[PDB]
Each structure stands twice: as C-alpha cells, then as structure tokens.
Amino acid sequence: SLSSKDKDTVKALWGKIADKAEEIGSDALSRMLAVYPQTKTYFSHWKDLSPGSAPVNKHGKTIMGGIVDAVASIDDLNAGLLALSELHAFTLRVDPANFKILSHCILVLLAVKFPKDFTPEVHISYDKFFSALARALAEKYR
Amino acid sequence: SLSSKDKDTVKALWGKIADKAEEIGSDALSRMLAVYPQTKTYFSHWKDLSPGSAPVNKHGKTIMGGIVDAVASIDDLNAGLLALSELHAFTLRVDPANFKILSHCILVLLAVKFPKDFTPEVHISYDKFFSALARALAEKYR
Amino acid sequence: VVWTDFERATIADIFSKLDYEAVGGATLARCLIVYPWTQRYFGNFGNLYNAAAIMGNPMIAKHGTTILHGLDRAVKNMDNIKATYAELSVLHSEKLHVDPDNFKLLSDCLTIVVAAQLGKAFSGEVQAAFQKFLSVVVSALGKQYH
Amino acid sequence: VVWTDFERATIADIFSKLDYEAVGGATLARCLIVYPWTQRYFGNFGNLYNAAAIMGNPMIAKHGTTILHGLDRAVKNMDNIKATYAELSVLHSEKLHVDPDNFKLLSDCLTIVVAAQLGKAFSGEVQAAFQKFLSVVVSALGKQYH
Ligand code: HEM
Ligand code: HEM
Ligand code: HEM
Ligand code: HEM
C-alpha cells in the first residue's frame, strides 16, 4: 500500500514527464521488446519493433495513457484498472510475469532522461506504485 | 481478491481440519525446514527441527493460530494481519520470498492428510487464500 | 548435482507408484485451473472454458502424460539430466519462451498431486528429495547460459 | 553463452566507465532502501534505520565496492563465468542462503544506477547486452545443480 508520500512522488514524477510521456512509452516498449524478447509474441501482429516505428509509437501512447489512468485512480488501483485487468486476462491473455518487465523498462527509460529524480527514496515510491499497478492488472486472472 | 466461493471453501476446509490443525502446523514447519533449508536461519535458536520436537510443535500451533486469525479476517487480510506483518518485517526481518515456501508446505501437508479436499477448484481457492495471506504479511516491508 | 543413496532410491520409488497418464493429466489440468495464465502456452488444445472443459480435455490429458514420460527420462538418467534435457531446454526457452516461473508453478502442482496420492508416505524427507529432483529438472529445462 | 562482438565491446565499455566504488556503494544502498528485506543478509553492517544511515554507511560502501569487483571477474572471464563464480555460488547458496530473487533485485538496481549515469548512451541495444550479461552472472550465482 502506497503512503501519501509515495503518491505525491509518483504524481510529481508524472507531471514532470509531461512533454516526454508519449516518447517515454514508445522507447520503454522498444526496450522491452529488445531486452526481453519473450515479450515479442504478444505483438507478432506488428512490423517493425524499433522505437519511432508507428505501431510502437502509437501503442506507447496507449500504455502511458493506462498509467496516467492509474495515477488518477492511485487511491484504489484495483477498481480503476478493472477493465484493463480483464482485457489483459481474457482478450490478450498476457502472462502476469510480464507486467514487471514493462515496469522495469519504463523505470530504466525514465532514469536515462530524468536521472536527478531517481534518488533511492523516490525510486522506492515509483517501484511500489508499479508493483501495485501490476497487481491491479493481475486481479482478474483468477 | 477472493470471491465469496473462495471464502466459503477456505472456511469449509478450516472446519474440516479442526482436530488435526496443531499437528498440521508442526508437520508443515518440519517440511519447510528440511525441504527448504534456506529457512533454517530464522530458527537457529532451536535445537531439533524434527516435527514432534517441542519447539516446532509449539510454533506450529502459533502459525495455525495466525492462519485462524487470517480466516476470521478473510474479508480484509491487509488490515487483519498488520501486526503480524510488522513483526515479520521489523522484529524478525523475514525475507518475503519465504512466505510462499511456507504456504506451499502447508498445502502439501494438507494434501497428504485431506486429499479428497484437493479438487482443482478447491486447490485454486486455497492457493488464492495463502497468496493473499502472503501479500498481507508483505504489506509492512516498505 | 550429487545424489544421496536415499535421494536416488526415493525418486525411483515415487515414479514407480505413479500412473503417468493419470498423474500427468491431473497435474497439467491442475496447473491450467489454479494458474489460468499458463493456458496461453497451449493455445491449440480446446476449451479455455470451465474447469470441467479442462478436466475432460483429451489433448490436455495427452500432453500431461507426455510431461510425465519426460520426467521419467530424467529418472533414467539421474547423473546426466542437463545433457538429457538439452533439446527440451531449447524448445521450452528458445522456441516457446515459457517464463521459467511456469516451470515452478507446474512442479508445485505435480508435488501437490503426488502428495495427495502418496499420503503419509510423502514425508518431509521424501518431499525433500522430490523437490531437489524437480529443481534439477527445472534448472536443466531453463535457459542454458553455461 | 555465445557473445556477439557488440555485446563483448558493450559490456567491457560499460565497466570501463563505472567507478566501482561509487557505483557499487550506490547500487547496494539503493537495493537496501528499495527492497529493505535484503538488509537481513547484512545483519552486521550498522544502521537498519533511515535511508541516510544506509547512504553514509561505510561498511555498505565497502561491500558495494566488492560486488563491483566481483562483476569485473566475470567481465574478465566472459566465456567462463560459471566456473569463475563456483565458490561465489557456494557462498551465497549453501552458506548465506540468499534467496535467488535477491540477485535479480540487486541486478535491477545496478541497471537503474548505470542507466542514470550513462543516459542516452544506455540505449535499448546497450541495455539488452547488459541484461544478457547480468542474466548469465545471476544464473552462475545461482545454486548450481549441474
Ligand atoms: C504497466 C503495464 C501495462 C499497461 C498500463 C498496459 C496498458 C494497455 C492499454 C491501455 C492497452 C489498450 C487499451 C485500448 O486502447 O484498447 C493495452 C493493450 C495491450 N497490451 Fe498492455 N499494458 C501493460 C502491460 C502489458 C504487457 C507487460 C504486455 C505483454 C508483454 C501487454 C500486452 C498488450 C497487448 C498485446 C495489447 C493489445 C495491443 C494491440 O492490439 O495493438 N501489456 N495495454
Ligand atoms: C503463513 C505464514 C506465517 C504465519 C501465519 C506466521 C505467523 C507467525 C506467528 C503467529 C508468530 C508468533 C509471534 C510471536 O509470538 O512472537 C510467528 C513468529 C515467527 N515467525 Fe512466522 N508466520 C508465517 C511465516 C513465517 C515464515 C515463512 C518464516 C521464516 C521462514 C517465519 C519466521 C518466524 C520467526 C523467526 C518467528 C519468531 C519465532 C519465535 O518467537 O520463536 N514466519 N509467525
Ligand atoms: C516439468 C516440466 C516439463 C517437462 C519435463 C516437459 C516436457 C515436455 C516434453 C517431453 C515435450 C514434448 C516435446 C516434443 O513434442 O517432442 C514438451 C512439449 C511442450 N511443452 Fe513442456 N514440459 C514441462 C513443462 C512445461 C510448461 C510449464 C509449459 C508451459 C507452461 C510447457 C509447454 C509445452 C509446450 C507448449 C510443448 C509443445 C506442445 C506441442 O507442440 O505439442 N511445458 N514438454
Ligand atoms: C550480482 C550480484 C552479486 C555479486 C556479483 C556478489 C558478489 C559478492 C562477493 C564478490 C562477495 C565477497 C565474497 C568473498 O569475500 O570471497 C560477496 C559477499 C556477500 N554477499 Fe554477494 N554478490 C551479489 C549479490 C548479493 C545479494 C543480492 C546479497 C543479499 C541480498 C548478497 C549478500 C552477500 C553477503 C551477506 C556477503 C558477505 C560478505 C563477506 O564475506 O563479509 N550478495 N558477494
């Protein structure tokens, strides 16, 4: 469970990455696909897995949108991400194993762009948020 | 999250195992220590890690007691197990990786004794229960 | 790995008591019901529906049995498991990309099916040797770096 | 493992840019702060208190340095990492009983410290090579069954 401290840190982070958000999601997705090729199977219906490629660009916008959703619902992530949980369970059937990979790649991408924001205490808030995220998306598996 | 059918299955089992519960806890702890010797370091202050040994016997009682608390608090494990969480985080400092080990050994011990209760759908409820348990005990780590 | 004489004997003894078809089918169906995400690796089997659909699935029973005979292969090659599973490792990592947590989830379900069958005979010490065997197995099935 | 040329170059190049003392001390501190249960393995260090106690801890600093030198031994032995880490694997499994999830936690923290330091240089390709290196090292550290 996130503290009020954790929530403000995450919300402040999410402000700061404003102009960069869609590009952050595209590059994080590129990182996942290249660093962890296990994940490529779910996007077989693509071209073109490099960042900057149009499918990756547009789906990176989509991922960051789901996370800005999580930020607006940070108080109860289980309820706020129910639709996305169901879709990742039943429509796409995504191994919950993989939510942490994406989160890691988002955090790595962020750290290359906003390193001053990754104090150990902040990284701790971000990790707790992304773990709560994954768990929220895992809710409807069983 | 446990469904009301998961909760009813868990309470049903808990009723069935009444006369055997303290012995289930002792044997499960015996299994943990021999199958997963990693866990032996937390009980260095013992003498004889066999089941039936007095310390393991009495601590088996105690575990099964915490699990009975969990059953009473099955509607919100996070709130119900908060002191036990704090204890396992700060007083004893237990690697949360170990909660799944003890849960598995409890399910194994139960299977050897009550195999008829291990239909696939029952096992699913029990596994969800002990996962939520483990996650409740993990709450106070950070 | 190096096996104790006790370890070597109880592994051989456990498998000698299992109906591979019975236990295999039961094991894989348990995994697919308790850990539904694993169903995704077997997209071409049948019903992603009820536990009843999984339970009567003949393709699932078939494949469950194949897993057990694959385990028997390790039981027949106790001091040579890595090499024995070399091609199965390639298949399961390189080709299928089975997240290795799944090997443990399936192993845990096998353990629980075996426990239920064997009963009080499945003591802590017997469970220790079974678990070491499954660790050796799952290690030889996983990505080989070395 | 089979390493491409870009992978060998990339790994050697990364380690050539890291001050082992600063990066090690920072990596271990971050692991102990972000995943505080990992503190238990280092019971004999000092302050289990604030992040500021962890950050100023000289013993933590020191051990962080040792981890980095440990990694250098794999960078200097890229085609023989398992054998190189044989006693290290024994130490962390058989002796210290570090749950292996912790190896990945620590490696992820180091990945974030290096990403912060290197910046745009730490591309997806560069991260892929570094992650492959760390996978090989974590498997080698790694209770060994073969
Ligand atoms: C933080 C974690 C994640 C978030 C927030 C997220 C969010 C989303 C959203 C918002 C959509 C599409 C909704 C729509 O516009 O219709 C989506 C689709 C999808 N997600 Fe995720 N997702 C996450 C993790 C993952 C992971 C780890 C994988 C696989 C490794 C995955 C695979 C997919 C796939 C295959 C689609 C459909 C893509 C398409 O049809 O183009 N997701 N995700
Ligand atoms: C189902 C999960 C668990 C439950 C319900 C549980 C419950 C309890 C309870 C009720 C106590 C009594 C506290 C006291 O009287 O001091 C306790 C103590 C303890 N537990 Fe757990 N526990 C669990 C998991 C674990 C695990 C996995 C480990 C380590 C591998 C562990 C290590 C300890 C230790 C070292 C103590 C103190 C022992 C003593 O006072 O002699 N616990 N636990
Ligand atoms: C106890 C560990 C396991 C053992 C010993 C094992 C063994 C085997 C064997 C012997 C085969 C037959 C290879 C062939 O067709 O020539 C096979 C195929 C396969 N296994 Fe595994 N397996 C294990 C675990 C898993 C797990 C956890 C999954 C996924 C969750 C999995 C997914 C598959 C798939 C998708 C195939 C190929 C399906 C087909 O083409 O018919 N296996 N396995
Ligand atoms: C990539 C990951 C790691 C590497 C390369 C590594 C390397 C090392 C090395 C080189 C030593 C000193 C051994 C000696 O003196 O011969 C050591 C000691 C130690 N490590 Fe690790 N380690 C890693 C991960 C971890 C983790 C995750 C933990 C705990 C969570 C840990 C806990 C310890 C402890 C308690 C010692 C005792 C130091 C001493 O001998 O005084 N290590 N490690």
XYZ file of C-alpha atoms in Angstrom, chain D residues 13-117:
105
model
C 32.820 -0.438 -22.317
C 30.233 -0.114 -19.598
C 32.567 -1.413 -16.913
C 35.353 0.861 -18.219
C 33.013 3.869 -17.428
C 31.932 2.831 -13.880
C 33.836 3.952 -10.760
C 33.429 0.615 -8.908
C 33.399 2.245 -5.515
C 30.820 4.931 -6.293
C 28.551 2.697 -8.427
C 28.848 -0.307 -6.068
C 28.105 1.732 -2.972
C 25.203 3.372 -4.739
C 23.821 0.061 -6.114
C 23.894 -1.714 -2.726
C 22.454 1.321 -0.934
C 19.610 1.526 -3.445
C 18.860 -2.213 -3.114
C 18.756 -1.899 0.727
C 16.406 1.129 0.531
C 14.092 -0.012 -2.271
C 13.940 -3.656 -1.109
C 14.585 -3.242 2.627
C 14.229 -7.001 3.489
C 17.503 -7.515 1.714
C 19.048 -5.770 4.751
C 18.721 -9.010 6.763
C 21.546 -10.670 4.844
C 23.926 -7.931 6.041
C 22.940 -8.011 9.737
C 26.492 -6.992 10.722
C 26.797 -3.628 8.853
C 25.401 -0.893 11.120
C 22.213 1.165 10.884
C 18.966 -0.582 9.968
C 17.492 2.938 10.349
C 16.854 5.785 7.885
C 17.934 5.909 4.238
C 20.515 8.480 5.447
C 22.141 5.834 7.709
C 22.313 3.434 4.744
C 23.723 6.160 2.470
C 26.536 7.092 4.901
C 27.325 3.529 5.939
C 30.999 2.800 5.341
C 30.532 -0.996 5.532
C 27.747 -0.753 2.933
C 30.058 1.375 0.762
C 32.815 -1.268 1.109
C 30.624 -4.267 0.290
C 29.088 -2.381 -2.632
C 32.673 -1.996 -3.937
C 33.262 -5.762 -3.537
C 30.146 -6.602 -5.610
C 31.509 -4.494 -8.469
C 34.896 -6.128 -8.313
C 33.065 -9.452 -8.335
C 31.343 -8.444 -11.584
C 34.673 -7.395 -13.037
C 35.826 -11.047 -12.636
C 33.012 -12.130 -14.978
C 33.906 -9.212 -17.445
C 37.439 -10.617 -17.477
C 36.196 -14.244 -17.865
C 33.243 -13.781 -20.207
C 33.413 -17.278 -21.706
C 33.889 -18.998 -18.345
C 31.600 -17.247 -15.871
C 30.042 -20.315 -14.210
C 33.447 -21.771 -13.280
C 34.744 -18.361 -12.132
C 31.770 -17.929 -9.811
C 31.835 -21.528 -8.460
C 32.915 -20.543 -4.899
C 30.750 -17.435 -5.059
C 27.731 -19.631 -5.845
C 28.520 -21.909 -2.910
C 28.979 -18.930 -0.575
C 25.628 -17.267 -1.494
C 23.572 -20.504 -1.661
C 24.970 -23.094 0.637
C 26.386 -20.684 3.196
C 24.423 -17.417 3.222
C 21.182 -18.846 1.770
C 20.335 -15.778 -0.222
C 17.020 -16.343 -1.942
C 17.848 -16.007 -5.637
C 15.101 -13.368 -6.262
C 17.535 -11.048 -4.466
C 20.136 -11.473 -7.175
C 17.630 -10.080 -9.665
C 16.594 -7.259 -7.328
C 20.211 -6.228 -6.931
C 20.881 -6.512 -10.699
C 17.819 -4.330 -11.485
C 19.135 -1.679 -9.023
C 22.534 -1.765 -10.712
C 20.769 -1.449 -14.121
C 18.999 1.698 -12.864
C 22.211 3.209 -11.398
C 24.018 2.597 -14.714
C 21.075 3.947 -16.792
C 21.113 7.139 -14.631
C 24.863 7.518 -15.071
